[PDB]
Design an enzyme around this catalytic site. Structure first.
Site, PDB file in Angstrom:
ATOM      1  CE  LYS D  80      76.656  69.323  39.206  1.00  0.00           C
ATOM      2  NZ  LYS D  80      75.776  68.620  40.173  1.00  0.00           N
ATOM      3  CB  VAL D 177      53.350  72.827  43.409  1.00  0.00           C
ATOM      4  CG1 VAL D 177      52.895  71.443  43.869  1.00  0.00           C
ATOM      5  CG2 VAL D 177      52.863  73.889  44.376  1.00  0.00           C
ATOM      6  N   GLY D 178      56.812  71.631  42.610  1.00  0.00           N
ATOM      7  CA  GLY D 178      57.570  70.443  42.189  1.00  0.00           C
ATOM      8  C   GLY D 178      57.383  69.309  43.180  1.00  0.00           C
ATOM      9  CG  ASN D 179      57.911  64.643  43.119  1.00  0.00           C
ATOM     10  OD1 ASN D 179      57.184  64.232  44.018  1.00  0.00           O
ATOM     11  ND2 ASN D 179      57.941  64.104  41.909  1.00  0.00           N
ATOM     12  CB  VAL D 180      61.804  69.448  46.061  1.00  0.00           C
ATOM     13  CG1 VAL D 180      62.427  70.165  47.252  1.00  0.00           C
ATOM     14  CG2 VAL D 180      62.759  68.377  45.557  1.00  0.00           C
ATOM     15  CB  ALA D 181      57.546  72.737  45.821  1.00  0.00           C
TER      16      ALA D 181
END
Lengths: 359, 359, 356, 359, 356
Positions: D80, D177-181
């Site tokens: 990283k 409620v993200g893009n992934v969620a």
């Protein structure tokens, strides 16, 4: 067998006799010039009168390609292979793997392709051994491009003789309805022109009448037909002391090779007011096509180099006036002047110079 | 364990024992011939009677592929890997990374692919380590091509026995409705032919009746069915002293391997007027397919090499008459004569020679 | 035979049966380990009782080389080829061109060189086909110089000084390697008792190095300080060990100990054994330096180091109270292992003996 | 600043401090392991408490990726980069060209990609300097794949806790409620499951209710909701001594990283009958995706490696029983056992060995 | 001429006519076989009666080299170039740059070197265009040293010992090769009777090696034990063979036998013929070792081996009761063939003399 004397005459480069007893391969790869780049020329497989004839053929054809490729604006010299064989009987995997290796052991000096007696299945075996080979359809029909080539040729001839590159109203006498002729007719029809045809196959002539509202004359007669343009799309030596006085058209322009039976035939046509689109400048379509295969096939750029056959004929026509000499001579001088001019302009040193083989 | 004696007998090249304790991998890569090029042959993973049996298997199968690849017109020799394992239990990433490295440490002498006991997911791990591996679908079903292969085989057999390569009217007894058999039926149905089928799965036979208006006979009975063509598309040793006198068809032609239980079985079939399309010439479709994957997959050229199974059988049929010997012998002599003839025609030196690995 | 069971036992990598009918070549290339790099190991060509014996030999010897190359500080794993045949009768150009190609079709996993039954002229034909072959362009005196340095470090533990003055050396066999060993030993002021199956050879030795010449089956019981087996192996057995006067064994011969049980009692007997495969390492270390690109001085300096290898084997034999042949096995093992870890870092341009 | 002591503890490989005054770049590239191959790990650009914190972060995250990539079945070690900066203010072309060159001057040991604080426009500049960089969309949204990843995770968890991998009837509490969620909900909805949601954005929760007939609970409350599955798809440390006794669901399974606030939290969940799908095994979708970009992007094979998150969780679940230890421990041991087993099976020598960088 | 019929007869590979008008180059590169590797063969530049003759020559000579290189244990097939011209008049930089490019446009299938009519300076120009050319950087004494070793093995069959003491050597021609041959023969205690078209040259010989100097057309009937033709070919005919006292023929000259019928009667006459193209192999073996990368010692050791080649040819001539020139033809053939098999295994990284 005065090989060297003949080679020195037209300054040929190599004649490469190849033999593989297992297969029986007896191939003459003849390389006339490589000034512009690798020599390109198909592998012809025909039975011969005598070994001497097979050598004379290879040489004749190879010197041919030097001039075709030159005028066609290719970066390729003239060569041709002649296998001595009966294609129907004497072929094997071996024989083409054999020849393939011999071509690879010229390392890009010679690039082959199909000719009389050889299939793409043939070149597909050669390809197993080398990539100095073009016309690989599995990678289709060159026929329509050769034809599109003639169409563009015909026009520039028409514009000189007849006064416009428009073929509407014009009556075209098309000798032979081959694959090339058929697709030529197609363009000629769909551009408002009237076709008189003929062929040794009648079924083929019926295809033509049916498709293009065409007229059907006997093989023997095509020459004396009242028309504006004669398109020999059958055999050569179709322009001889027999056919030339018979001829009504004021423009000759076909797909056939060696339209002129001797060199003194083109000379009298010039003095007769007939406008000859020289054989090897017009049917250049077929080579220009397989030649564009090597750069990596591009339908548009391919057809644009073919499109230009118009401008090639136009220049040949011009020079034939500017110098008062038959169109086939202006063509020979056009090719010569090109080969020569590049030989100079490109004699500058580069350690990373570019060619059709660096693709 | 008379390995060398057996190796020297049929002039095998290498038997390569590979072991990786971490995984437990115990693989025998056996390479019979590499005259035509890299040996190709799948990785079979089955549990064995004894280590000796696993070695004898590897060798048997590898000598097999030499002849398959030969006749199939491939530029590939014969090899096969046998892992000793229970595919359901003994597999790991390690075990296939392991074997992958060992294959890369033969540097193109051996090219693997799937067999009994191995998945494409398996080859996909091997591919992490080498590119000397084919049948990578992520890059699908070989099954329809193997089948299309048999269809073409069947025809040439029909034309010899029955008098036409047309299969309309002809009644085909199809043993097993596998994926290969199903797609074979498909072609056979859609070419106007009537199918009698059988399988150890009944659901599969119902698929067949429902789709192709077919007849359903019990496994035990398929042999004695009145028909024109017997297509073994199940197990081998299906052509034995039990089944051959039972047999009504005048043509055998299937997808199954080792159709003949002993070599003396094919001999009596010949003398019986039955026309045997030899196992390893017809089901060549599957290999010819993954083999074309290496050149770089081309659906058309792939199917055209398969298409040619017709002409291969046709020649095998011819030689079986021209020399009065069973079709499986003519096939062995066809492969032999090919290997041999190329070995000569290609013994010319080149410093940049071409092979399937230079793609 | 249950090959795979044996392979899995000592975690062998490959056993590669090679055959070429035109020549008649029947070669077993056995590869034990390649953790350190390409396996190196000569091609032995001997006649065998049975094919099974030829396989057991290949495996035995290959596992051998893994340990030799390891301890000798080489970047090479263990392999060995065994051709099956009678070197005096069954050789051909073909047979070595054949094997050459098979070696090239392992693409550097195996590097051969001469052994029992193979000439340089043999490797010179193999070289026509591959460069995974050494000992062909500019070994006997180096193997010997190797033992000389071995002997010393053994002396310093048993005797108290790496000087060999006052020391009596009993040299079994006056072979190529033995002769050149004696040379150095003589010209350092140590006293040589010799023996061999050739007597004229032993007279060369007495004549040159003021030596005593004793019967083959006497060499063991001779009043001496150092025993140098430079002939056959299994020369350190229940019959020779109680007969032994020397308190240092140090020779060129392979498998000096007849069973592993034998080295164990020598340890408890005060006697200091320079382990076979650490000392004769001279010959391998030499052909091994051929691949880096031959350098006479650096080559002899890696041989010179056999001193320090024995010295460490001696040390460990005390620090752990175990026979010197065990410390040697653990020395090689601990090396293989330690590097396997320290080098498991990724590089896209990794270096090996083959990258030069 | 006891760097070496910490490095030696978990046997890190390199910490590479990079500085370019022109730009102001202050990047720590930390490489934990490269056993399986090049280390992969994004470039995080955040402002830090103190330089010491930025170093501890780089190391924490890098050791993370070693285990993610391991379990995710990638051939990649853990690394990283942490830039020290305020992404909104301190970025320049220079700063990314700078870092690009430093990455190229690790010659494939480290492969970067986007993280917190970095855009693809950022990686697109780095790409000007090296190809050891993935997530280049101009060559799109990783979000749906991460989500599809969780869906497959959730199932295997459900089948252990609830008794079937079917999510029909099952009530899912989705934190954030993200893009992934959102895309997770999408799958969950269209597979017959009922969603209780929550977010710091209300507009986003209305999108969810409107699209998937979902229930809306306040941020603070999501934990105590009667449901079957808790999906943390917001922040980490969401599984602490505050939330765990509040928890009704018998399965935790989300997209969020460091779901567990301390290691002793996962331990009590195990003993509580709750089935924890461990963070870094499930959200592996996003890495598995950009990781497949390097092989050369293939939508199908990419999603198939993600598909397998099911089987990864299934094994983690199994081991958690077979050894009576929390699922996050079985996961750590799964990754460890993999790294280790390959390290052995691949320690065979090859002079032409293969890796993700030879594509 | 019916070229292809002749090509198919002895299974020739290629006949490559090359022409460059600016120079005037008219070269026939004929390639007989490349089974063992690249064809090697010098560029002969001679004036010819007719073009047909120049083609027949190229083919004759090329088929020659296939057998020379084979038996000489080289990894090279047979080829030869014939330029048509008068070396003293018709050469130019162009003509050799020209041919150079044509050789490069066979990409290693043909490797040239000097022959009759070509200088090193000639090959040095060819080298400007290609490296498929040898004999340019560090042959007469080697060809000779070649014959010396040949002579011996012949002596040992006929005479009973490879010692040439007591033996009387009749040396036809004192050319470059002959002179240096005599040198070795003299300094080994054998007795030299000489002759040549130059007498001053023969006086150099008598003066240096205590030789007798006899007329050209006497050399044959001279009381002697060994006949060394080192001038012209067809020197072993119906006129010379009954005149011959020696029981060993062994020379540097090519085509010593006038017809194949001649070697057959020599065999039945007790007389031991060291076959032409096995002995003078020295010169080729030398330029051939130039390509591996010149090594004086290894080069001379492959020449040294002409002894062992003759020895085997002699052996086979008994084991099969056939003239030595036939055993030699069968030796080359059996080699070409045996390798063709043993090497037909696939490798993607195959090695050849050109890969170094």
């Amino acid at each position: 067998l005065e090989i060297f004397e003949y080679l020195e005459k037209y300054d040929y480069e190599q004649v490469v006799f190849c033999q593989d007893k297992e297969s029986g391969l007896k191939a003459i790869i003849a390389i006339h010039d490589t000034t512009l780049g690798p020599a390109l020329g198909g592998t012809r497989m025909w039975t011969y009168d005598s070994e001497e004839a097979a050598i004379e053929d290879a040489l004749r054809l190879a010197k041919g390609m030097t001039y075709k490729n030159a005028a066609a604006g290719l970066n390729l010299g003239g060569a041709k292979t002649v296998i001595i064989g009966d294609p129907r009987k004497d072929k094997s995997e071996a024989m083409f793997r054999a020849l393939g290796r011999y071509i690879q052991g010229l390392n890009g000096r010679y690039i082959t392709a199909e000719d009389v007696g050889t299939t793409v299945d043939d070149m597909d075996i050669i390809h197993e051994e080398t990539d100095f080979v073009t016309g690989i359809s599995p990678s289709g029909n060159p026929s329509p491009v050769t034809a599109y080539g003639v169409y563009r040729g015909m026009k520039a001839a028409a514009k000189e003789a007849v006064g416009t590159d428009n073929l509407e109203g014009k009556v075209i006498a098309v000798q032979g309805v081959g694959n090339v002729a058929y697709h030529l007719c197609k363009h000629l029809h769909a551009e408002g022109a009237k076709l008189i045809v003929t062929d040794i196959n009648k079924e083929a002539v019926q295809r033509a009448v049916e498709e293009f509202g065409a007229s059907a004359v006997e093989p023997n007669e095509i020459y004396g037909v009242e028309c504006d343009i004669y398109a020999p799309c059958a055999l050569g030596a179709t322009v001889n002391d027999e056919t030339i006085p018979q001829l009504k058209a004021k423009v000759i322009a076909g797909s056939a090779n060696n339209q002129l039976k001797e060199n003194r035939h083109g000379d009298i046509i010039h003095e007769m007011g007939i406008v000859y689109a020289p054989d090897y400048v017009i049917n250049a379509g077929g080579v220009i096509n397989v030649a564009d295969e090597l750069y990596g096939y591009n339908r548009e750029r391919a057809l644009k180099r073919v499109e230009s056959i118009y401008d090639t004929i136009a220049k040949v026509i011009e020079i034939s006036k500017r110098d008062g000499i038959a169109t086939y001579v202006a063509a020979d001088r056009l090719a010569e002047e090109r080969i020569a001019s590049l030989k100079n302009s490109r004699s500058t040193y580069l350690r990373n110079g570019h060619d059709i083989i660096s693709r």
